[PDB]
Amino acid sequence: PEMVRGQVFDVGPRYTNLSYIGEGAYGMVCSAYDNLNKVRVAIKKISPFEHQTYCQRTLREIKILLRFRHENIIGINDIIRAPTIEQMKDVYIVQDLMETDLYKLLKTQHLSNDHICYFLYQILRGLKYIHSANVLHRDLKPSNLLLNTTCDLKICDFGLARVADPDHDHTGFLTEYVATRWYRAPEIMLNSKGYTKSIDIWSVGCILAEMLSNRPIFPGKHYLDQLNHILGILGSPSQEDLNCIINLKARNYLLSLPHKNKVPWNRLFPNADSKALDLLDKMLTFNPHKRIEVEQALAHPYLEQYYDPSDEPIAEAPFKLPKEKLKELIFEETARFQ
Numbered sequence: 001p002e003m004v005r006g007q008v009f010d011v012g013p014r015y016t017n018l019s020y021i022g023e024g025a026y027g028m029v030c031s032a033y034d035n036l037n038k039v040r041v042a043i044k045k046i047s048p049f050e051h052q053t054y055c056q057r058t059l060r061e062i063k064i065l066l067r068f069r070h071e072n073i074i075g076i077n078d079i080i081r082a083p084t085i086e087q088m089k090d091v092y093i094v095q096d097l098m099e100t101d102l103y104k105l106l107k108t109q110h111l112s113n114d115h116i117c118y119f120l121y122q123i124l125r126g127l128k129y130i131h132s133a134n135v136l137h138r139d140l141k142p143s144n145l146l147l148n149t150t151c152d153l154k155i156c157d158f159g160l161a162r163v164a165d166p167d168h169d170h171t172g173f174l175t176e177y178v179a180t181r182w183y184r185a186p187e188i189m190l191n192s193k194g195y196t197k198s199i200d201i202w203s204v205g206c207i208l209a210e211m212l213s214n215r216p217i218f219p220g221k222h223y224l225d226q227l228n229h230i231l232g233i234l235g236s237p238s239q240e241d242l243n244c245i246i247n248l249k250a251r252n253y254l255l256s257l258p259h260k261n262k263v264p265w266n267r268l269f270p271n272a273d274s275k276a277l278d279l280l281d282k283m284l285t286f287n288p289h290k291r292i293e294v295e296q297a298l299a300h301p302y303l304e305q306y307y308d309p310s311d312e313p314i315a316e317a318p319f320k321l322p323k324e325k326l327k328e329l330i331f332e333e334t335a336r337f338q
């Protein structure tokens with residue numbers, strides 16, 4: 001039982017010679033050699049069983065990735081677990097190993113426009129597939145985008161993913177959210193549960209902006225501060241934008257704010273490709289109903305060199321409890337790999 005950073009990984013004997021990669025709230029990721037396929041891989045140790053929420057997230061993630069098969073989406077090579085429900089304390093997800101992630105990359109490397117264009121294309125390509133499956137990733141960020149030496153990109157971390165539920169998206173002002181603050185759409189703070197595809201598009205716009213400058217565009221220090229940052233660049237929402245906000249506390253808060261002017265994209269990104277700024281504007285639209293859709297984004301002039309509808313596949317089969325019972329469902333989903 002090899003140990004990484006005081007954490008025991010029961011992945012032997014197929015997987016030997018382990019190296020640490022990253023640490024999650026209820027899971028850890030390492031690299032390891034695969035003696036059966038003769039290559040290093042990534043292994044995710046998930047220990048969710050002590051909490052129901054963590055158990056919910058694990059089941060959904062496993063279910064989705066086991067259904068999904070796409071070049072721009074991390075798949076599951078294998079799942080390791082104890083032979084019995086009683087002896088199962090942790091679940092191990094084996095995945096292809098990627099050299100790095102976008103978060104790591106942006107910290108020290110300036111991206112060329114060619115790189116920005118290709119990365120963005122691959123994100124949207126993957127996202128087209130996800131959304132075609134009626135699924136929402138709900139946690140897109142640079143750290144969840146893996147890269148390799150040839151600039152191939154794969155979306156990872158489907159823990160907060162859900163089936164789209166447009167008709168059950170409304171909620172009140174300042175309703176608590178789980179996904180990464182800096183990438184939350186303005187509507188989350190005002191009237192949305194984040195059950196619509198537009199939520200993912202906002203996140204992609206934020207990533208694009210971050211690719212352009214190597215700095216997060218809306219770095220909120222707390223819940224409402226996030227909305228402030230967004231308004232600080234987008235400016236005051238139009239009357240039209242406001243008519244879609246019918247819950248009064250959210251509507252009256254916006255109306256209470258002093259008029260703010262829109263900061264021009266070209267002032268924020270003086271070196272940016274103009275077509276890139278045009279698409280950025282469309283992704284970062286305050287009104288989620290006016291926000292560009294994934295397929296629309298792919299057909300945008302900025303991505304003309306890579307756009308090919310025939311080569312941007314969609315899902316063949318879209319998606320239509322106490323902690324203990326969830327453990328049982330996790331057990332069953334993983335039985336195939338025993």
Ligand SMILES: COCCN1CCc2c(cc(-c3ccnc(Nc4ccnn4C)n3)n2C)C1=O
Binds near residue numbers: 028042097156158
């Ligand atoms: C417990 O966390 C759950 C959420 N979560 C975030 C951390 C993570 C996941 C998958 C990988 C992974 C997968 C494949 N290759 C890589 N490579 C890689 C990336 C950076 N550096 N490196 C070497 N990372 N990482 C690093 C993942 O699903």
